[PDB]
């Protein structure tokens, strides 16, 4: 074993299997701790006359003679921690009128002597916790007088008698959490004076416990973990003196008025759940409180004198309940932290916030604030968190938010104008109702939760100076081509036949559609470089509307006129129909009409992007009004392909040739256009393909009205139909 | 069938809730029998068989006799005795004051 000069010999985890010999005549300490000794023979420490510290913890020692202890008069410190020790010793640790400190935890103790803790008259701290003990020692702890610390922690205890500890006087600490306690009588603790830490704190306590008014001096209090739900009021009333409740994690439903009131010395109170308590909680006298923490209840008022009372209140979380009015706050100057959310304010008047020094984060999302004055925060300095979301605001203030860190403003849908990025110079963390206000921060790098992106452009709307010129040809092309065919074929007011009628409609449908794309033109020359400010009022106003309906009325009459004109040409090359083909253009035309109008019955269908344009969505959305138009324009081409194809099945008149070959040139031309557009429609239902949003927009905006100022130019160039309809204009004109 | 007897003239008068313990090699000692000042006895749930205690002031030797005895149940065997007041009678060797020797046993 391995000695010391201090008389401190040290023989832990040598792997002993007894007393070890051979050592100095007299000692103070001794460690034998670690090595396997299983039982104690009679006078095994008659060798050590003056030992005064023995630790026996860690090895399984499963029996002490009692007269192994014997002669350790000047013994002071005995750890029997780790160990078997089925029962507490009562003969072995007699006679030792010396010790201070007994450790007897770690054993698998059951039962304890009634002779037990008899002959010694100084001990002072004394373990019983990690024990499997049924009932609370009554009469060996009456033997102790001088116990100042005692923890039967994590027995199997159920109840403590009453006058459980009468004669522990002088005692200071007491603990008893994690055990099953579940009923405390009225007396159990009396006589127990000068006791300043009470910890029962994983019991199965209901009721709570009135016993704790015969502690006239009491610092700590931690019922935890129980089943308490009503606190009565005067429920410390004994105990004018303490600092510490701990009552986390019970469930609470009424908390009393004047519960925890002329309570001078405590620090904290913290409620939570406490659903049934109305009025705020009567504080006259606790005025050391330094952070109140409520519950989500129906409390509506807050004490003007708040600020009045609580000199030193550093933190208020009045959070989930119902406030409607905010006092002035004036005073407080060490408050830091204000949390309220979920309440119910509906403005923030000037005063409200006045002084409040060190206020540094401030919390006042999920409330129904509709107005804040405009020197609201003006004298706030050191204000670093804002948290204002969904509070259903419609202006903001600036002045006095110069050294924000971080501001949240998502739910104020109503809350439009741009922010100046000049008054919040110190941001690192935006979150702002609309992609468009977020661009002007840029991105000191500034974090702003709604991407700007592509598809919600504050620069430029259609993007590249190719794009800007493709589509302004294009949207010019099929205006005029559109609206030369339309005067050209219904000028001619004759019989006009279905063919003549369809491709008339169909020219309608692209002029429609041309001016759809004139109007995103225009839109972009009239905000080129400065679409930041106009974003916001395109997408919610009525011009993103009336766009995107256009669009998609245009796109959907034109696909359905197509597809009857297929159908027109089957039963022509089978076989006087003209009422019925007008009639089913009528019908064509009204679906077309009722499908561009749902998205204004659905919910913000076109306030995706400026486009307007529904169907090309975003990865979250997938939509069912897309996905079903996609699928039926997609069915629909499947349909008209199968029946072209049996046509030509059925077909291997000049007229007739010419009729069928140009509307399948148109077929080939629609199905290609709109193939492209399908596909990234689709793309964000799957998770594997991953396509760039500039690509996309520019793809959409190129391919979209393609087919429409396309087919006028394929019916004025390759169709002698529309030569002989200019020749018979020109003799009409002139 | 093997019979052990504890001599004890020690005492002065019979102490009560004098007892025998087996201890396993290495291990705890349990209280296979206990008998009060009264003549009370208290065995062992699972230890109890056909074995009995008997003890005598005018003989002070506590007889233990077994018959049948097992393969399983041969151990060293203790005898304990309580003279002073006090306590409740049990087979847990805290209470016991004084112990003897111990004999082992042979099984057949």
């Known amino acids: 074993c391995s000695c010391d000069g201090d008389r401190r010999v040290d023989c832990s985890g040598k792997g002993l299997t007894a007393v070890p010999e051979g050592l100095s005549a007299f000692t103070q300490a001794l460690d034998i701790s670690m090595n396997n000794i299983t039982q104690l023979p009679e006078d095994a420490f008659k060798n050590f006359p003056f030992l005064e510290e023995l630790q026996l913890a860690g090895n399984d020692l499963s029996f002490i003679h009692p007269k192994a202890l014997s002669g350790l008069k000047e013994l002071k410190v005995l750890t029997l921690q780790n160990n078997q020790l089925k029962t507490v010793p009562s003969e072995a640790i007699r006679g030792l009128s010396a010790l201070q400190s007994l450790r007897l935890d770690a054993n698998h103790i059951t039962s304890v002597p009634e002779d037990s803790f008899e002959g010694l008259v100084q001990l002072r701290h004394l373990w019983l916790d990690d024990n499997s003990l049924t009932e609370v020692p009554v009469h060996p702890l009456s033997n102790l007088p001088t116990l100042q610390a005692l923890t039967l922690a994590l027995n199997k205890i159920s109840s403590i008698p009453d006058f459980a500890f009468t004669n522990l006087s002088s005692l200071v600490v007491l603990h008893l959490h994690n055990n099953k306690i579940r009923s405390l009588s009225q007396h159990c603790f009396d006589g127990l004076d000068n006791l300043e830490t009470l910890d029962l704190n994983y019991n199965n306590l209901g009721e709570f416990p009135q016993a704790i008014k015969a502690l006239p001096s009491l610092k700590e209090l931690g019922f935890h973990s129980n089943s308490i739900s009503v606190i009565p009021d005067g429920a410390f009333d004994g105990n004018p003196l303490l600092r510490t409740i701990h009552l986390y994690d019970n469930p609470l439903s009424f908390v009393g008025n004047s519960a925890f009131h002329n309570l001078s010395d405590l620090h904290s109170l913290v409620i939570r759940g406490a659903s049934m308590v109305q009025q705020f909680p009567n504080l006259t006298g606790t005025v050391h409180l330094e952070s109140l923490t409520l519950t989500g209840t129906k409390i509506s008022s807050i004490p003007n004198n708040l600020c009045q009372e609580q000199k030193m209140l550093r933190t208020l979380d009045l959070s989930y309940n119902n406030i409607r009015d905010l006092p002035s706050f004036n005073g407080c100057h060490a408050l830091e932290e204000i949390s309220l959310q979920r309440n119910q304010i509906y403005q923030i008047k000037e005063g409200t916030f006045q002084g409040l020094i060190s206020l540094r984060i401030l919390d006042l999302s999920r409330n129904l604030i509709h107005e804040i004055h405009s020197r609201a925060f003006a004298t706030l300095g050191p204000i670093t968190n804002l948290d204002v979301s969904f509070n259903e605001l419609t202006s903001f203030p600036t002045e006095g938010l110069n050294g924000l860190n971080q501001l949240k403003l998502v739910g104020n849908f109503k809350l439009k104008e741009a922010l100046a990025a000049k008054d919040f110079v110190n941001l690192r963390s935006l979150s702002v109702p609309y992609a468009y206000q977020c661009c002007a921060f840029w991105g000191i790098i500034i974090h702003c939760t709604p991407s700007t992106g592509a598809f919600k452009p504050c620069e430029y709307l259609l993007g590249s100076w190719m794009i800007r010129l493709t589509v302004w040809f294009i949207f010019l092309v099929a205006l005029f081509f559109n609206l030369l065919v339309i005067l050209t074929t219904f000028a001619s007011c004759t019989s006009l036949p279905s063919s003549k009628l369809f491709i008339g409609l169909i020219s309608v449908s692209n002029l429609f559609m041309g001016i759809y794309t004139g109007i995103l033109t225009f839109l972009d020359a009239v905000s080129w470089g400065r679409f930041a400010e106009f974003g916001i009022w395109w997408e919610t106003g009525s011009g993103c509307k009336v766009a995107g309906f256009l669009a998609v009325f245009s796109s959907e009459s034109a696909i359905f006129l197509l597809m009857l004109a297929t159908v027109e040409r089957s039963l022509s090359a089978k076989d006087n129909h003209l009422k019925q083909f007008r009639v089913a253009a009528l019908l064509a035309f009204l679906g077309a009409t009722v499908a561009g109008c749902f998205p204004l019955f659905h919910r913000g269908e076109y306030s995706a992007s400026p486009l307007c344009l529904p169907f090309p969505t975003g990865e979250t959305p997938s939509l069912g009004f897309t996905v079903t138009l996609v699928l039926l324009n997609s069915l629909a081409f499947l349909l008209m392909a199968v029946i072209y194809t049996k046509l030509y099945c059925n077909l291997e008149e000049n007229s007739q040739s010419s009729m069928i070959k140009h509307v399948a040139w148109l077929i080939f031309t629609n199905c290609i256009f709109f193939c492209p557009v399908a596909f990234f429609s689709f793309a964000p239902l799957i998770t594997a393909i991953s396509i760039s949003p500039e690509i996309m927009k520019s793809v959409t905006l190129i391919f979209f009205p393609l087919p429409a100022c396309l087919n006028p130019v394929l019916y004025v160039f390759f169709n002698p139909k529309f030569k002989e309809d200019w020749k018979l204009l020109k003799r009409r004109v002139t | 069938s093997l019979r052990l007897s504890c001599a004890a003239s020690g005492y002065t008068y019979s102490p009560y809730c004098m007892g025998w313990f087996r201890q396993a090699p290495g291990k705890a000692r349990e209280g296979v029998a206990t008998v009060d000042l009264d003549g009370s006895t208290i065995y062992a749930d699972s230890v109890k068989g056909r074995f009995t205690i008997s003890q005598d002031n005018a003989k002070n030797t506590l007889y233990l006799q077994m018959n049948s005895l097992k393969p399983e149940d041969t151990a060293m065997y203790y005898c304990?005795?309580?003279?002073?007041?006090?306590?409740?009678?049990?087979?847990?060797?805290?209470?016991?004051?004084?112990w003897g020797q111990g004999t082992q046993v042979t099984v057949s």
């Open positions: 304990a005795s309580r003279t002073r007041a006090g306590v409740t009678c049990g087979l847990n060797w805290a209470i016991f004051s004084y």
